[PDB]
Amino acid sequence: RADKYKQETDQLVSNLKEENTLLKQEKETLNHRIVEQAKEMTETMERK
Amino acid sequence: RADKYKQETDQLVSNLKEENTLLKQEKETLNHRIVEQAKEMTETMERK
Numbered sequence: 001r002a003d004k005y006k007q008e009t010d011q012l013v014s015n016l017k018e019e020n021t022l023l024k025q026e027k028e029t030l031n032h033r034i035v036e037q038a039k040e041m042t043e044t045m046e047r048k
Numbered sequence: 049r050a051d052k053y054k055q056e057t058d059q060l061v062s063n064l065k066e067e068n069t070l071l072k073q074e075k076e077t078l079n080h081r082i083v084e085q086a087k088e089m090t091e092t093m094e095r096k
Contacts (some may be wrong), residue, residue, distance in 0.1 A: 002050035009057035016064030023071035030078045034085065041089050045096070 002053070005050060005054055005057070009053070009061065013057060013060050013064060016061065016068055019068050020064060020071060023068065023075055027071065027075050027078055030075065030082060034078075034082055037082070037086065038089070041086075045089075045093065048093075
């Protein structure tokens with residue numbers, strides 16, 4: 001019982017941690033895209 | 049030891065699930081913010 005519980009819990013925890021890290025990276029990339037789009041689009045504003 | 053491992057890993061699994069769901073929701077809302085901001089600055093294009 002202990003061995004099976006340890007194995008399945010470890011697998012679930014590792015997968016969930018990987019998913020959380022991926023979600024954090026995606027959010028950071030979205031924020032960077034926000035900044036880049038705002039800057040470039042304001043530059044186009046000024047150019048036009 | 050099996051019981052203590054079970055408790056710790058159940059807490060970890062619950063926290064990881066909640067964090068994953070919250071981060072996915074935050075990423076989706078961030079993308080919605082991206083779309084809304086892009087629309088707002090396009091509208092500023094036509095208005096200005």
